[PDB]
A paper describes a structure:
The major regulator of virulence factors in L. monocytogenes is the transcription activator PrfA, a member of the Crp/Fnr family of regulators. PrfAWT is a homodimer in which each monomer consists of an N-terminal domain (residues 1 to 108) and a C-terminal DNA-binding domain (residues 138 to 237) linked by a long α-helix (αC, residues 109 to 137). Two α-helices in the C-terminal domain, αE (residues 170 to 178) and αF (residues 183 to 197), constitute the two helices of the typical HTH motif present in many prokaryotic transcription factors. Glutathione binding stabilizes the DNA-binding helix-turn-helix (HTH) motif in a conformation compatible with DNA-binding, thereby allowing expression of PrfA-regulated virulence factors.
In addition, we found three new PrfA mutants in the remaining three strains—Leu to His substitution at residue 140 (PrfAL140H), Ala to Gly substitution at residue 218 (PrfAA218G), and Ala to Val substitution at residue 94 (PrfAA94V). All the previously identified PrfA* mutants, i.e., PrfAG145S, PrfAG145C, and PrfAL140F, could grow in this medium with G-6-P, as could the PrfA mutants PrfAL140H and PrfAA218G, whereas the strain carrying the PrfAA94V mutation was unable to grow. The PrfAG145S, PrfAG145C, and PrfAL140F mutants showed the highest expression levels, followed by PrfAA218G and PrfAL140H. To gain a deeper understanding of the PrfA* mutant proteins, the crystal structures of purified PrfAL140H, PrfAL140F, and PrfAA218G were determined as individual proteins and in complex with the PrfA hly promoter DNA. We expected that the crystal structures of PrfAL140H, PrfAL140F, and PrfAA218G would be similar to the PrfAG145S structure, since our in vivo characterization classified them as PrfA* mutations. However, their structures showed that each of the PrfA* variants had only one folded HTH motif, with the remaining structure residing in the PrfAWT conformation. The PrfAL140H, PrfAL140F, and PrfAA218G PrfA* mutants all had a folded HTH motif in one monomer of the homodimer but an uncollapsed central core structure. Consequently, we suggest that these mutant structures represent an intermediately activated form of the protein with features characteristic of both inactive and activated PrfA. The most striking structural difference between the inactive, intermediate-active, and fully active structures is the position of their recognition helices. When superimposed on monomer B, the recognition helix in monomer A is shifted up to 6 Å.
Author numbering:
A (entry chain A): 2 to 175, 183 to 237
B (entry chain B): 2 to 237
The structure:
Amino acid sequence: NAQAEEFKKYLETNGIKPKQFHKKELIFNQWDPQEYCIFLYDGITKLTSISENGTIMNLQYYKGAFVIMSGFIDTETSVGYYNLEVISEQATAYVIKINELKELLSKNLTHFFYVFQTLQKQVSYSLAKFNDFSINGKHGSICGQLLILTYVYGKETPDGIKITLDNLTMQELGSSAVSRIISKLKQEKVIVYKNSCFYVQNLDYLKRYAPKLDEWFYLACPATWGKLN
Amino acid sequence: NAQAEEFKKYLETNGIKPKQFHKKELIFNQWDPQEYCIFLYDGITKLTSISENGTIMNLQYYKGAFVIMSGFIDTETSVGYYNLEVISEQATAYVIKINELKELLSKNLTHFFYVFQTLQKQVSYSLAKFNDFSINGKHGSICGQLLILTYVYGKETPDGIKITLDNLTMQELGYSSGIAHSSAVSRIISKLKQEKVIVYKNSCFYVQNLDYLKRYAPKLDEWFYLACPATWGKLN
Ligand code: NA
Ligand code: NA
Ligand code: NA
């Protein structure tokens, strides 16, 4: 992603070094008083919350390249008691104190527009998820999450759209009601297991039940949307 | 709102004037290829998506002051086939072409942060809406909406905390909770009047048990505490 590679060099040329993380590590957590701006360059993470019970909740997924900010840019304070956990085997990330970021984004508007637009993609993603769930319920959410994975990691082949993604990580991403919905799609031959890999074979099925997330992808990632359309 | 009033001045000093919009008007629409940045200074609006079927989906709500951009600041293309409908009697908004915005947010950083901060409030608001819904479902969603309406439009009266809105439609109340049809909403509200959490009296909604709403809208209450601590402190 060109605009992301440019933001990478802009951070390095300004002295900011990357950092490695491993599965189940927290890049930022809900208890640190210091808030941070995260440039997830490589890997897959998830935003998590906790209730009074101590139930963990999964709220959002992020793949690199992308930006995640745990604090408001102006006040420099938490936007919510969230933790950012790595679920891939490794993840390369740049961690920036929010105050440090603003003098940094000031001296180059192009990178400001980059970060600014990542927030926009985030807003509309959540509204398309809500829109799809409002119509086709949890079955719409699952088909949407499958549609995203298909567009991002899918390669067209004779067996279908192979999800180029380790089966470990792919099993996690996809509650008891959640298990049954995924399997029924497997039952209906929407996504098939074959030769240690998973292939998507009824892309129209996913587009049908996650139509607003299919639009979000079209309006936000047209080039990635076009390869399989 | 200090930083919002300062954004108002910056626009008027650049030739951008306010515009009156009456109820049911669309400040931007999903069919207009021109995308805009909307600085809703006063009034109440809702984001909608209209299907070919002709059904209408209520996705988000905004009061002034706030900022709603229909296009991506960089590409200037649509972020989604959405409309911004006015649901208050009148509304006051500064309507800007996206390309003209990059020219202004360039010259001032301070404002650019302001609009940047609104986006952050949107994201964390949708995630808090979602969070409270996963734990407490439709009941929590409605509690959340009532709680925010209590914080923002709360006046202490002998009949509890009066929600100072007019024509405050029960259906518009459910649309904001993420609930489409009036059956479920009617059911939930019934249990709330029975449990003496709310009362429908002078054509209007009064809150009588604030702690109850906080109990089932914690993540949304935690959002307002972190997002609008001044307004949050009114009733805590
Ligand atoms: Na934090
Ligand atoms: Na194509
Ligand atoms: Na539009």
